[PDB]
Amino acid sequence: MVLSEGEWQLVLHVWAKVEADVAGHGQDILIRLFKSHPETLEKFDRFKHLKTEAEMKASEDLKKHGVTVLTALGAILKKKGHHEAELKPLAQSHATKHKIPIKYLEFISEAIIHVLHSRHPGNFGADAQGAMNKALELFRKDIAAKYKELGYQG
Numbered sequence: 124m125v126l127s128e129g130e131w132q133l134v135l136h137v138w139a140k141v142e143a144d145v146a147g148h149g150q151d152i153l154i155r156l157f158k159s160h161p162e163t164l165e166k167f168d169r170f171k172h173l174k175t176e177a178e179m180k181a182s183e184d185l186k187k188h189g190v191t192v193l194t195a196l197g198a199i200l201k202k203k204g205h206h207e208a209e210l211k212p213l214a215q216s217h218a219t220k221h222k223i224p225i226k227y228l229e230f231i232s233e234a235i236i237h238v239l240h241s242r243h244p245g246n247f248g249a250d251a252q253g254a255m256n257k258a259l260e261l262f263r264k265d266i267a268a269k270y271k272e273l274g275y276q277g
C-alpha cells in the first residue's frame with residue numbers, strides 16, 4: 124500500500140502529541156492490550172505474573188518497556204513508508220525469539236487506536252484515524268511479508 128503525504132501528515136501530527144508523554148502513552152497502550160486480550164500477556168515472561176491493572180500500573184518495568192515499544196514504532200512511522208531497515212531486526216526477534224503471531228500485532232494496533240482516540244479527540248477525528256489505521260496496516264503487512272521470508276509467517 125501507499126499513504127499519501129496528507130495521510131502521513133495526519134499520522135505525524137497526532138504522533139507529535141503522543142511524544143509529549145511517551146511513557147504515559149506506552150503504559151496506557153500495553154495495559155489496554157493486556158486487559159482486552161489477556162492471552163497476549165502470556166507472551167511476556169517478564170510480566171506474566173501481573174494480576175491486576177493496578178499492579179500493571181505500578182510496574183516500573185512495564186513502563187520502561189512501553190517506552191521502548193513506542194520509540195521503535197515512532198521511528199518506523201517517521202520514515203513514512205521507507206522503513207525496510209528498521210523492520211528487519213524487529214521482524215526477526217518477534218518471529219524467531221518471541222513468537223508473536225500477526226494476530227497479536229492486530230490487537231496492539233487496536234489498543235493504539237483506542238488510546239489515541241481517548242486522549243487526543245481533537246486531533247484524532249475520523250480522517251486522522253483512517254490515516255493511522257492505514258499506517259499500522261502498512262506496518263503489519265510489511266512485517267507479515269518479512270515473517271514469511273524468515274520462515275514463520277503467521
Ligand code: HEM
Pocket residue numbers: 163164166167168169191192193195196212213216217221223227228231
Ligand atoms: C507496534 C508493535 C510492536 C513493536 C514496535 C514492538 C517492539 C519491541 C521492541 C523494540 C522490543 C525490544 C527489542 C526486541 O526484542 O526486538 C520488543 C520486545 C518484545 N516484544 Fe514487541 N513490539 C511490538 C509488538 C509486540 C506484541 C504485539 C507482542 C506480544 C503480544 C510483543 C512481545 C514482545 C516480547 C515478548 C518482547 C520481549 C520483552 C522483554 O524484554 O522480555 N511485541 N518489542
